[PDB]
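Quick one: sequence plus magnesium ion SMILES, need structure tokens.
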Amino acid sequence: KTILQSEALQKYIFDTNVYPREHEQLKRIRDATFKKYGYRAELSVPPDEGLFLSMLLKLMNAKKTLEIGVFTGYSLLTTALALPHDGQIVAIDPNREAFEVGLPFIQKAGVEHKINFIESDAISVLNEMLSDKLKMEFDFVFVDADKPNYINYHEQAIKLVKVGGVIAYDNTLWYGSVVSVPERLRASQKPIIELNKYLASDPRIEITQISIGDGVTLCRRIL
Amino acid sequence: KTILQSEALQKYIFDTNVYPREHEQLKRIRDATFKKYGYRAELSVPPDEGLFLSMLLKLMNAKKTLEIGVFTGYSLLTTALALPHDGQIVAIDPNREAFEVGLPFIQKAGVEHKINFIESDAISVLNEMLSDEGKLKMEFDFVFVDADKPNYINYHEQAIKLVKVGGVIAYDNTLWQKPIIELNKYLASDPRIEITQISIGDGVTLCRRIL
Ligand SMILES: Nc1ncnc2c1ncn2[C@@H]1O[C@H](CSCC[C@H](N)C(=O)O)[C@@H](O)[C@H]1O
Ligand SMILES: Nc1ncnc2c1ncn2[C@@H]1O[C@H](CSCC[C@H](N)C(=O)O)[C@@H](O)[C@H]1O
Ligand SMILES: [Mg+2]
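Reply:
Sure thing.
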């Protein structure tokens, strides 16, 4: 899986610059995820994107983060390992079963204490955060869930992220189809095109769309 | 050029997510670069990589940077615009004529005061910095290496002493040929850095100094 010019080039990146520095428990998540899910393992953040997100989190000095869409936990464990010892993550996914595929390796990595996993749909949780008593504020928000709700998440996340914080959207080049379409991915083409147009014109954010993985768009909140 | 599956996909990134947000003086650098250097305009850091570097510098809170390889100044102006008002950039290139193509637009953007442009080969400039004991602890937050590929490993061993612990050295063109193959192996096995290779532009490898 790649949006690059060649699968060989994608493998060069993995072999040269990811797998030799990949945490062993991240490898364990990858192996377990393919064994259970087959091609659906491609739902995971790819390992080169993971390593990038890790250094991004370190460079921003992020400590409080929100993850919408957990699956078996590759990006969640990536995030927990990058954060300092007192980092805290709110991680939302209706599929607790997938989460428990990765949880033994999260536990082995010693970072379970950083994670608040919420088995729920994200819309209601983020609406409760906005409606809750306390001040929810995040350094970083990773949106990697159900694409038809991405614009809805944006309007929630732009209230919950700090000014100067980052909201990151995954899959924003969607197999190249934003410019094309593989028939089974057609349903998600429109919502990603819609999200791309929405972020492109948003004055409250600075953006960079990065041709890593299946496309990552970073949104730095400035208003 | 693009390392993506299709040129249409690359152009989509530019049209949708770069040009509507691109500083007008960066556009003017792009146009003047084609007018003077033609298809060597391709040597410039591409617009999507520009916004990426800009976002990196803002998130890092970078203030002092070093640029090796300037050409007509697209990445240099990108950097100057991302830095705070009191930011400083040291920019090294033997081609002063190319720099002076972009200079009017750097000046119109109001950021010329941030820039110390040095007309030289970078190896000797950096060796002089390493010799300058008195300013050795005046370190850079960010180093961008975008020059002559056969010297990249040499620049690494200089830059790793010039950048702060926790700062970043960024190598351009790491998905290029031999000096890049060698560089990629060298950084992969360097215990003094953490790395991430990003498939943007011609390939960018970020090196965060940890020792
Ligand atoms: N309404 C919703 N709210 C939150 N998550 C949802 C959701 N609907 C679907 N999802 C979840 O979105 C996930 C997308 S895959 C997430 C991949 C993950 N970031 C990783 O690196 O492994 C799926 O696990 C799915 O269960
Ligand atoms: N020994 C050397 N030291 C510093 N720069 C060098 C060099 N040898 C070649 N170069 C320069 O490296 C540059 C590469 S093109 C640089 C692109 C620039 N960052 C931009 O965005 O426009 C050329 O301008 C060339 O003059
Ligand atoms: Mg993903």
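Chain A touches chain B through 42 residues (CB under 8 Å). The pocket of S-adenosyl-L-homocysteine (ligand 2) is lined by residues B 43-45, 68-75, 92-95, 98, 121-122, 146-148 (CB under 6 Å).
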